[PDB]
Every structure is written in C-alpha cells, then in structure tokens.
Amino acid sequence: MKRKGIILAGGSGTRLHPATLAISKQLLPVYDKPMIYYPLSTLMLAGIREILIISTPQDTPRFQQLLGDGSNWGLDLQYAVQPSPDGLAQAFLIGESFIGNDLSALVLGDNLYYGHDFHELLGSASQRQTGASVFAYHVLDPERYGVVEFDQGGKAISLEEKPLEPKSNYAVTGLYFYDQQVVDIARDLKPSPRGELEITDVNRAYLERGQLSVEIMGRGYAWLDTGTHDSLLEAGQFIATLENRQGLKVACPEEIAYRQKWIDAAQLEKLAAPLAKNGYGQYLKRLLTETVY
Template sequence: MKALILSGGKGTRLRPLTHTGAKQLVPVANKPILWYGIESIVAAGITDIGIIISPETGEEVKSKTGNGERFGANITYILQDKPAGLAHAVKIARPFLDSAPFVMYLGDNLIQNELGEFLNNFKTQNMDALILLRPVPNPTAFGVAEVDEQGRVLHLVEKPKVPPSNLALVGIYFFANSIQSAIDRIQPSARGELEITDAIQNLIDHQKHVEARQIMGWWLDTGKKDDLLEANQIILDAYLKSANAGEVDAQSQLSGRVEIGSGSKLINCTVRGPVTIGEDCHLENCFIGPYSSIADQVTLIDVDLEHSVVLQSAKVIGIHQRIVDSVIGQRAYVHTAPQRPKALRFLIGDDSQIAVV
C-alpha cells in the first residue's frame, strides 16, 4: 500500500499568503498543514509516500518536509507541471505507484478520524475505491455523492446546482490499481482538467466495487482564512499541552495550556491558553488571548492579540487596539502611526509592511 499526497495548486483562496508559498505549508498550531496528513498516513502503517508538487512551490515543500525521515517514511516528490486535475496527478504518479493500491490525500485537508479503520475496510472487502464523505450545509460547493443503504456509491457529481444529497467528498480516497484504467477512459472536464470524480464515476459505470464511509469527527479544508483559524482552534483544543522551554519574567502571567519554545522571552506579558509560541520569539507588554499560534522568531511588542495566527519572523509593534481573527504572514511588519483606528482585522501576506494610520 502506498500514499499519494497532493501538494500543488495555486492556493488562490489563501492569497496573499500563498503568493509566496505553498498553501500546504501554512502552519496550524505551528506545524505545516501538510505534515498532519503525512503523520496520519504513517500512523495507518503506510510509509511509502509520493508527494505531488508544483513548479512554483515544489522546492519549498521539498526543503521543509525533507525525505520523510522525520516521519518514519520514505518520500518521493513528483512534479506536476500544471494544475490539470486530481486524476491527472494520479496519472503522472504511475511510475511511483506502479500497480500498488494507494490512498490519495489532499494536502490541505485535516480530519479527526484515524485512517486505519477505513484502510482495513478497503483491503478486506477488495474494493476498487473507497471514498470518505461528510454531511455539509452547502453541498453545492463540493463534489457530492449519492449512496445507497449498503454504502455503495450510486452517483457522483462535482459542485451540483441541485445536489442529490448533502454528502460532500472529503479529500481522502482509497484506490486499487483499477483507477488507472478509469482515468484512461475519461476526458477533461469543461474546465480542462481530468476530474477524479469522473474517474470514480467511470468505475461505478463499469460495475466496479465502489463504496463510501462517513467520517464522524471534524473535517477541515484549510483553503480560506476563516477555515485556517478554525483549524488552528480545533488543533489547539485537541492536542496542545503546556510546556515552557523559554524565559518568562516575574511580571508575566500564564494561564491555561501554554506552550513556549526554547529561546523565547516573555516580558510583562499575559497569556491565556490555549496558545502556542515558537522558538526565539520576543514578546513584551503583550496580551495573548486564546487560540493564538505564534511561529518562530516573531517579535510582538505592545500588542493585544487573540484567535490569530502569526507566521515566522513577523513583527507587530505598538498596536494598542486588539487584533482578532487575523493571519499575519512571514516577515510581515505591522506598526502603528499617531492616529489609531478602533478595530483591526488582517489577512497579511509574507514580506508585507503595514502602517496603521
């Protein structure tokens, strides 16, 4: 059994952050989204992993993620020259996949459920494909499945105007090698891409064994700012443990679960968890409220912040109005001018400079 993780795409919904980096490397609780998928796959016992990368961000994905040793896996990188669809990604991965069954995992997805139970179902019942589904309130925005009472998939449709159900396809699929023949039989969609939903529908049309399982825990597609903040909140709630490897002076107060990395210094700060603070940060005269993640080498001085994500090497100085529901990119510099507004809300890309006037 192998795994194929998709880490290409342009990340248009998270711009401007993704003008300069891969959306799958945007951190949730100070860990790249992509790494959660790798860890989930390895926990299911799959260690031979291919990662689809794009020309724009592939080198960054490779340099940060490495050869898989840190995860106990072996990672092979596969270049997709253009975003020609999920089924196209499977097609170009054939030399890596060979004839092996595989799990395909979209690299900007997070799910609560472990993969082991689904993998066992897929193997023991000799399926051609197993798809994961989740009820959603807005099925017109997703690929949607119609399923019978036995869990067999009857029909798939991509972003339907009139959905046959409210069951959206989660970005995780289990495939036998028969998916390759199905991909060879389909044509590009109206948007010029080889759609994986068309390939799965082709399996169904050829009487292949295609089933679905509903996931019961949370599912997060981290493609937009609010999704990213929600994912950050859920991960901090579920997994954060208190740990302090930094320096906290006597005037600072920590309450709740707070994680502080080595080399970080807190001077006259109040931090109310869950909050994670990376390594080599400097925080002075700050209030850091719940559900905030502060990456490595960040400087915060005279800042009141909560429910926000601050990326590596950003600086925020002298902002006395509370910053909430914000994502501040790598190396961004935010500071105040003499006249100050009453409220602030940001989505700030990497290398930005913001003067609040």
C-alpha cells in the first residue's frame, strides 16, 4: 500500500518573538534554504510524493507561494489549516480526508535530520503495513520531549510526554509512520492537562496494543530542531560546514526529485534557469553533468 505524508508546520510564534514577528519559524532559512525544505526532503527520502502541508491560517498561503502544487518537483502538495495550536495529534483530524484509507507519515516542520543511509533508516518503517513506527535518539535534555523507556533487553516499554523525571535519555523524534488505524485513534483522544491533543498519546495507543515499533536513530545521525535562537544558529553553522566542505547541498528537494526519477534532466534545467545568477541555480545545473555517488 500507498503512504501519504503530512508536514506539521504550525505553532506558537510567541516564543521566538520578536525575531519571528515578520517570518514564522518554518519559513526562516536554515543557512541557505527554507526550514521546510528539510522535513519535506525527509518525506521525499522515505519515497513519499503526496504530501499535505498543515500550517496556521496566516502561514498556509505563504507555504503555497513558496512550494505551489508541487508538480515542478514531481510531487502532489496540498494545504490545510490549523486554526489553533491545539496539539500535534490534530493533524490527523485536519488530514482525515487527505489520508482516506491509506497509510501515512507525519513529520514536524522544524525537524532537520542528517546522515548516512537515511534511506535504509526510513525504508524499514516505510514498509511496515500494520502498526506504527517511531524513532528514538539519545539527547542531553529528554525532558523537552516525548521520552521512550526501554527494558534491559532493548524493547520499548513506556512513553511519557515531557516527563519532569525522564526514565531515559531517548527522545522520540518528530517523524512518525502510521497505518490505517491512526485517524480513529486520534478521534478518540481527549486533550491532555496542558491543553493538547498529544502525539505521545497516539503512539502509546499503539504501544498498549503491542503494535508500536521503536527504531534507534543512532548517534552517527544528527537530529537538530530549530527550537530556539541558539539552536537555529547551530543548525545553520552545521549545514554550512558540511555544504562548504563537500560542495554538495543537504536537503535540496530539486536534487532529490531528480535522483529519484521524479523529474527529468529537462525538468531540472527549467528549475535551474531562473536561479542561474545565484549559487543554488549554479548547483542544480552542475547536477545534470556530474555523477555524485
């Protein structure tokens, strides 16, 4: 079966104000491209082409000016609104229609992943047609996240959203794969105390049925989020140092669509033209004549 993708890019701007008074978080660039390009690329890497972008009323159209219908890139992009930041799990209600009876995946708009064989990392959750899959990453500050505890032999046994007393240092990252059950599970949720329809609650509903797979995203991968002013800067220096060392870009959607045969040489050259004066255009052009392994 076919899997559809959602990017949740909405949310409170009150935190990063006044920095984000003119531009919301996921519309800011990370080094040399819009934040949203990173998670989008994530979904492309997992082989997903039909993607729903959920944002604030005010931001939806911006994302549409930026990305279009996605046909330029071999994608089918649609848009929906989150009237109010009332929980990541609402994504499934906003998207019920878009999901239909298909499998799905959700990624958070400010989640930036980097590393080797992200294809094989995703591939495996991608292929599971029953149940749900999530990824755990070792962090310094687990209490800011959904936290997954494991027993002595490695199996996940508990989940807790932002525990005052975390049971482990493994955070659940902002990338989740679901089967056809997810929308009915979300339907039944009641808001937590902190006023939110919790993605941790969905994931636990699968876990309590023995249907939650928890994969380790190893320390050789970099999972960054653009939470704060200090974190955005580190994410920018991190992308800059890789890009400048390699002369290759991270998370360039045009490149990915081309590597995946979603667009052809000819399509890519058309994308390159209007960018020809700058480095991003120059990059795309180099890609039609260079083999990159």
